[PDB]
Amino acid sequence: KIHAYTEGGKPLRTIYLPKLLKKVFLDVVKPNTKKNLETCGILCGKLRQNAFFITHLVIPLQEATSDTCGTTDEASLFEFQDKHNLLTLGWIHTHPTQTCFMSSVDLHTHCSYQLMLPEAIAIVMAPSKNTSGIFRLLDPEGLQTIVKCRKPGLFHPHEGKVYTMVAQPGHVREINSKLQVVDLR
């Protein structure tokens, strides 16, 4: 029914995303959001019949400010994913006060996930605007720009189009599937 392709013509496998995940994530991290702290989660799942299913939203040990969030114990995160045979398929985070977009930090982070899995997606929630988006970098052009980027500064801008929303319809399909939230904090 759907064949999705990157900007460079590479086929993208489907990722099935539970339609409940965005709302559940906001519910789980709401105390952080109210304190004006960002929070991140990992989108974990499985490959079955050439399609990815997100099955687990994993909230890793992390630290945050009003403008940043980040994992602090990736070794424990690995151990959990390894034991349960869960693939990293993407990530999600909040912008407690900002608009919905991919920041400089988001782009440099996501670039690595997308290099390791062409289908990787970044979900950005902006609860104060009641907006959200699912993003990825342009492949190969956006990935190349970020890989080569040596511009200093945690919040530096980029020239050119580097990223895009996933298409509707495209390789990400929201469906009525079960979801498990794993809070490792």
């Binding site: 490959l47 070794a75 690995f78 693939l87 990293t88 400089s104 899995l117």
Partner: protein
């Protein structure tokens, strides 16, 4: 002078050419050169242990054909 593997949590396996005297820091630089991932985003895990930047493969007695595991740091903003 030997080859090791770096396995991701995405079903990808990376091949690297290294030497016993390479530091973990060097291994991460090689991963950056080959795959485009900055060293500060990389954590390398071997046999239940996170490897440290200042140590060498030799320090850990890591043999040819060994498989290291890569887990990325996450940073959002």
């Amino acid at each position: 002078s030997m080859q090791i593997f770096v396995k991701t949590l995405t079903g990808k396996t990376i091949t690297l050419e290294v030497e016993p005297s390479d530091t973990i820091e060097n291994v991460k630089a090689k991963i950056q050169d080959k795959e485009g991932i900055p060293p500060d985003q990389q954590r390398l895990i071997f046999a239940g242990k996170q490897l440290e930047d200042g140590r060498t493969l030799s320090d850990y007695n890591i043999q040819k054909e060994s498989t290291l595991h890569l887990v990325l740091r996450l940073r959002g903003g």
